[PDB]
Amino acid sequence: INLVRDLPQGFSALEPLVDLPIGINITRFQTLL
Amino acid sequence: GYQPYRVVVLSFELLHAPATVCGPKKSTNLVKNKCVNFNFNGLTGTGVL
Ligand SMILES: *[C@@H]1O[C@H](CO)[C@@H](O)[C@H](O)[C@H]1NC(C)=O
């Protein structure tokens, strides 16, 4: 979406790139740089 | 008594972790224009193509 600044708009959808059939204890998502 | 005769014995789980990836197209080829009850395991194909 060609944008410049401060426009959190845009409407679309998503496909499952990967389904890792792990089924593990998941509630923490530390996202780091 | 001791000649080399090696064996690898196997075992499957009592489901400690469910299956990973399931069966492939153990299949024959395609068909056409004549209704064929066929199975995709999720798309029971019954009717003409
Ligand atoms: C973590 O995953 C295991 C997998 O069997 C499950 O049995 C266990 O209950 C999970 N732990 C929590 C806190 O949900």
Swiss-Prot record, chain B:
Look up what happens after changing H16P. Answer: Increased resistance to human covalescent sera neutralization
Specify where the region named Disordered lies, as residue ranges.
16-38
Q: How does it assemble?
A: Binds to host ACE2. RBD also interacts with the N-linked glycan on 'Asn-90' of ACE2. Cleavage of S generates a polybasic C-terminal sequence on S1 that binds to host Neuropilin-1 (NRP1) and Neuropilin-2 (NRP2) receptors. Interacts with host integrin alpha-5/beta-1 (ITGA5:ITGB1) and with ACE2 in complex with integrin alpha-5/beta-1 (ITGA5:ITGB1). May interact via cytoplasmic c-terminus with M protein. May interact (via N-terminus) with host bilirubin and biliverdin, thereby preventing antibody binding to the SARS-CoV-2 spike NTD via an allosteric mechanism.
| Function in brief | Attaches the virion to the cell membrane by interacting with host receptor, initiating the infection. The major receptor is host ACE2. When S2/S2' has been cleaved, binding to the receptor triggers direct fusion at the cell membrane. When S2/S2' has not been cleaved, binding to the receptor results in internalization of the virus by endocytosis using host TFRC and GRM2 and leading to fusion of the virion membrane with the host endosomal membrane. Alternatively, may use NRP1/NRP2 and integrin as entry receptors.
- This chain's protein is named Spike protein S1
Q: Which organism is it from?
A: Severe acute respiratory syndrome coronavirus 2 (2019-nCoV)
